[PDB]
Symmetry: D2
Subunit: 368 residues, 4 copies
């Protein structure tokens, strides 16, 4: 039978989830999910967006969305603030959960959520857009197949400039409670999701951070920016391999520059999300023709064929979310494991909070 | 009330239209179109895809679908010259038409369609989806605004390699009777759609063409390839301005390389569809910083903000079709003109056929 | 004995020749050419630049440089209108000639020079330095080896913007009588040298052209620009293969964008001179890894190893000229034929002037 | 005219020779006199003296450095002879152009730095990546406030000349006789660029690895003692952060010295494999906002001496002609050359500090 969907939130990621749920069966076949309940505030906004998004109804009561008998799975995309409350309420109501990163603002809340998930017998997945591109998934498979030999180094970054303007006003997100981590939270967690998928688990971090714009306008006065604008870290993976890692929300000229490369004993892979349809692969070759290959995204890569049969017809950012919906759909059907669930996700939260601790204490942080 | 939709065909473009119709209101607001009837063959396939696409019913008879009283607009997406009969039948039934290229194989048939469209007083649009990218629409606006001065030269190409391998079998597409034009028909029409939107109408062409792989495998023997693998032409626009134009279905390594540039008296614009989120702009600057700008697609560009609030989250090929659906939707409502209708579309047919004729005769062809 | 060198001109290409002759033996071995006489105007400039360039003396009289007993080879880098006179004089005096393109202002003059060169039994080479990069030369070898299969299309361009500003003053270079061709002369000839080296001889052209800025400032008033700012042409090669060709001196944002592509039945090669150290090669590959390769210039490519042992240490524009000098030195010594000599070069002049005629008359031109 | 001595004729040796030959061609003044070339064996010194245009070849570098017709000495030999040759030149009253490194050990470099000040001669270290018109233009742009205040540096120097595990073991792979690995071959160059952009390094925390631990030797295997790759987090004297790496086993990279400076009002980005491009972002109106590709041309320092028209790509070897000119002008008292043995010592301290941090697992302060 068709999956009954509830959606909480309609912003950047809320509407992304909505577009995804709308076309998951168009792309992948099977039964179209039923868009049952959309929750958002104010109520008039929830009603108007429910209409245009195609949800059977809208409400300002998020608990209605998680408890409706016709709902099987809940997409949660509202402020990180109430993620634990909403996710745990949905699991308690017997609903599968698609939770936008982060799990919660602290490791402690994430730990409790992880335990609730294991008790509920429902499927969970954390929204990690950037692990779903055909280019990224192709890279993981190429590494798995030995295309670059043994990985010997990872270098990744995630630069954007959405906070570079110092006139941008203060908000609750720039506080430790209310907001949690800064660039590490909004960007770093995404890079960690990609990094651990490529290199395996993180064994140790040593990090440094900075707040470049330390105070911002707050209507007459100013208030202090409490979380980091940028951070960098050196990594040791559980394999013993090295890594470099960074993120920034003040890196002028960058808009979605999640970029990484894996250097191996027999090749190199390189990617930049601002050009998400290109994957660069070097493997040793005859001297006359030796050099990096530009692999342009097409049907040979995971997921792409469900969207288009011809290569070079660029896959979009939003289609990453359709792929993510499908993974959850199949996991609910018992036809495939979804990653990361709340257990896998908690590890990612531990890593990013470990980097924040390292930057503050000046000490390396180790993981089991 | 919401627009009632009929869809004919389910391949490359059929699925693309279906995804567009499903998310058009999600992206742009208003009422979601009602997916009423899907027509395809065989019947079991029409029924299977109606279910997964979310259409109320499938049918093996398209004539049924176009006359359904619950239908207001008909998407015609067969990868075929066989569009005249379906297009005119829809218009005759008082339905608006979203037609995939070409209008027909012959200019004569396209001309009949153009007249039926005017007589019908229903809206029409041809699926020239490469005119819908935020980057392309931004370029047109920059030109209109005087950002590069007066255009002095156009250079465009559309290379792909889907027929490059001589091993690839013969098919009816390679006949003049059933396939019509070659590269000019498959790819050239698209380049013309973009070119004339940038530079204005074509006054004259002088062209060359080649069939470089003259025979292909066919049922244990070979059959002759009757249309062109590639073609090039020098253009004069009605403006008096010069142009260069090419297309190829045998250009090894290229997958969707619709690439163009407009050189003006005060700057230059350059674009490549394989990187559809980048627009290159040169305008004179102080010597120390002078150079082309990489304009990364974001909410400053037409259409983008309906899909994502943050720049650099790559807009995709399929989202062009959502934009196209919205343009038609607004034209139906009487709140904008959709381009190109069958009148504008006919001109495109005349141009590609004029290029083909010029290549065959070795003489220039005039259009005005 | 070391080659005795005369140099006429000290501008863009004159100084490029001077730097090349100075280090040709440093790169390639053998005896360093002797820099004997530098000719330039005015005399004070010739003396000054001779000193800094390392030439034994400078003179204001090009005839002195050509006739000097210690001179064996003459580099001619002066205005196109004097090329025939200077080249013929050098040949008549028994000197080998390195002549900057073009040969002359007319096909008629180029023919006379071609005849004079054969009459003389001295070596000649025309200075088409874009045929000298390791990337270009590697591409020619890859095509010969079958790396892209059978070539089926050529597409080339040469955009620059040195004349894009309409306030840039008029000069005699912009008349047909004294300046000759416009963009076709300054840029087109370079693209032809590359194009024919890749694709073989041209059989036919059909061209269009424009002068975008028809009048320019001249000493408070205005004067007419008589030659083209841009031109485009469709090509048929002697092989039967198709081509696209263009040039422009008004293409805003481009500085040395000589760019070309050869598409073949088993691959594609693509190049852009603004990134002269990269050659793009597509060949079929398994679907998981299929794509163009970025071949970064290194010691695997012709000429590079004479300048650097390590790949990725970018080869420079000026080092193309060092390669060109060595080709001439080896030709003079009987150890290699240099291309293009005045005979090969005459064909290039015929092609560029045929394009100009085609654009003027609106008719194709056959060769 | 400057009397030139040249010691060594391999990669850098020829590069120096080509530079000395064209330095006056490009920049004017008097062509330096190519007096004595020293190398071994004797036949090679004479052969190359002839093709390089030096008045004579010799197998004894000591006689070349003490020659009265010599004013300046280019030293391009193996790292293990740099101290001896450099101090001998300075003691003979000759100016010195020295290829990196100053020496294998910081202790030796310090002694060299002492001798340099006491000799009153000019010294320059061959950090040629600081000589490109693009790099020099970047420094000037930062000085004009084009990107505001620098807030982060990220740099790398990847190459793959040791990536093939079948490449034989050599003395260069010994701590004793090769010194540092990737940090010495590549790291030093990245430091020269980094401090030129960001000022002095205050602190580093580093990691390193030997990826290929054993290599074929005579009958077989011998252990590799120095690092194939290293990374570090940087704190500059300014307080600004940095990321730093180098590798000799990064497959596909040939000369990927790449750096980026992010500031409060813009970003600059560069990659030596495309040394004629400098990427600059500054905020712009929404419709046209984005990075600019600045193609190297006569607006950039040094370029016009080589070509009057932009986009005619400046090459690696021309960086060395620029370096030669800077030394010449320093000798003539018309401009100070960087880095001298004093500035050079600081660079040795940083790279060795990074090596120490990686070995001990502790940050190192300067």
């Amino acid at each position: 039978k068709a999956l009954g969907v509830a959606l909480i939130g309609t912003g950047f990621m809320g509407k992304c989830h909505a577009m995804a749920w709308r076309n998951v069966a168009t792309a992948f076949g099977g039964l179209p999910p039923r868009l049952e309940v959309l929750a958002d505030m104010p109520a008039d906004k929830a009603h108007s967006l429910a209409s245009s998004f195609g949800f059977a109804r809208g409400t300002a009561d998020w608990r209605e969305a998680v408890s409706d008998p016709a709902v099987d799975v809940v997409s949660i995309t509202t402020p990180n603030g109430l993620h634990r409350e909403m996710a745990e309420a949905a699991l308690a109501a017997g609903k599968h959960v698609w939770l936008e990163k982060p799990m919660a603002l602290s490791v402690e809340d994430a730990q409790a959520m992880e335990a609730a998930a294991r008790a509920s017998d429902r499927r969970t997945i954390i929204g990690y857009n950037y692990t779903r591109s055909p280019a990224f998934r192709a890279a993981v498979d190429l590494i798995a197949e030995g295309a670059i030999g043994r990985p010997i180094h990872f270098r990744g970054m995630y630069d954007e400039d959405y906070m570079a303007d110092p006139d941008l006003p203060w908000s609750w997100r720039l506080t430790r409670k209310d907001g949690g981590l800064g660039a590490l939270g909004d960007l770093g967690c995404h890079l960690v999701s990609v990094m651990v998928s490529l290199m395996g688990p993180v064994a140790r971090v040593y990090a440094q951070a900075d707040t470049v714009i330390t105070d911002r306008p707050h209507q007459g006065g100013t208030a202090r920016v409490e979380n980091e604008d940028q951070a960098q870290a050196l990594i040791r993976f559980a394999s013993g391999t090295s890594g470099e890692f960074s993120c920034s929300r003040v890196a002028r000229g960058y808009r979605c520059r999640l970029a990484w490369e894996v250097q191996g004993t027999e090749g190199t892979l390189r990617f930049d999300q601002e050009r998400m349809n290109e994957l660069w692969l070097y493997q040793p070759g005859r001297p006359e023709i030796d050099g990096f290959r530009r692999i342009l995204t097409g049907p040979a890569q995971p997921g792409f064929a469900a969207f288009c049969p011809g290569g070079g017809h660029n896959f979009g950012f939003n289609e990453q979310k359709v792929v993510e919906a499908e993974m959850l759909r199949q996991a609910i059907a018992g036809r495939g494991k979804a990653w990361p669930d709340f257990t896998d996700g908690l590890t990612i939260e531990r890593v990013i909070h470990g980097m924040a601790t390292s930057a503050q204490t000046g000490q390396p942080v180790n993981f089991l």
